[PDB]
Amino acid sequence: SMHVTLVEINVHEDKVDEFIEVFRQNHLGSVQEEGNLRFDVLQDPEVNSRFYIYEAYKDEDAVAFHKTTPHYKTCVAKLESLMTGPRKKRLFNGLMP
Amino acid sequence: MGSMHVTLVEINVHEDKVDEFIEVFRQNHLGSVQEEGNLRFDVLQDPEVNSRFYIYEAYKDEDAVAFHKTTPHYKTCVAKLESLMTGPRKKRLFNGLMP
């Protein structure tokens, strides 16, 4: 059904707001991609500096398209100065819907 | 606290019951996406462990989160997963910011 990834991102405490602004632009573009099914931006309820991005695409070609877009490319660039460690990704097979 | 309330529920089933789990859980997915409060009830499978699933349950409010657990499809699904699950479900909670 869907190619799904949940990425955990930890950012510096003083760059929480910057991270949300940056990711807003990635969300806004990514939800408009033709093969996008979700691009949810989640925050840990206890740790204000830890975030999870829930991305779902119809297929591999869509996943791939996503990583060529200007909104993705800008995101990655603006994120380097923000993170406290490497992102932790998990892939899933989206069975339903 | 969010544009939505998300619980990621991890479920692990007997290795020879992966298909039976999908058949049962299908009906909870189909009932739960009709819940007024529901925004997602995505059913995910670990690509490396076929018998490990994660349900992304996203609701508008906490009243809806609780109401889900009163429903005939939820109760039916709990009773049928008694013989399939390898132990108790595990939950992780998140606050939605977007959308």
Domains detected in chain B: 1-99 (3.30.70.100)
The two three-digit tokens of residue A3, written as one number: 């190619």
Q: How far is A96 from chain B (nearest CA, A)?
A: 5
Report resolution (Å) to 1 decimal. Answer: 1.8
Q: Nearest CA to B25 among B91, B96, B89?
A: B89
Q: Report A:44-63 residues touching B (Cβ under 8 A).
A: 44-45, 52, 54, 56
B97 and A56: CB-CB below 8 Å? no
Q: How far is B89 from chain A (nearest CA, A)?
A: 18
Q: Rounded to an integer, what distance in angstroms lies between the CA atom of residue B74 and that of residue B80?
A: 10
**DSSP alpha helix (H) spans, chain A:** 16-30, 60-66, 70-79
Per-residue CA distances from A35 to A59, A62, A92 (Å) = 7, 5, 17
Q: Rounded to an integer, what distance in angstroms lies between the CA atom of residue B21 and that of residue B81?
A: 7
Q: Are A84 and A90 in contact (CB under 8 A)?
A: no
Asked if the C-beta of B9 comes within 8 angstroms of chain A's C-beta atoms, the answer is no
Q: How far is A26 from chain B (nearest CA, A)?
A: 11
Select from A54, A57, A89, A90 the residue whose CB has the most chain B CBs within 10 Å, as the one to mutate to test that interface. A54
SS3 B97: strand
Within 13 Å, how many C-alpha atoms sit on residue B64's CB side?
19
A41, A45, A93 ranked by CB distance to B44: nearest = A93
- ∠ CA B50-B55-B58, nearest 5°, is 160
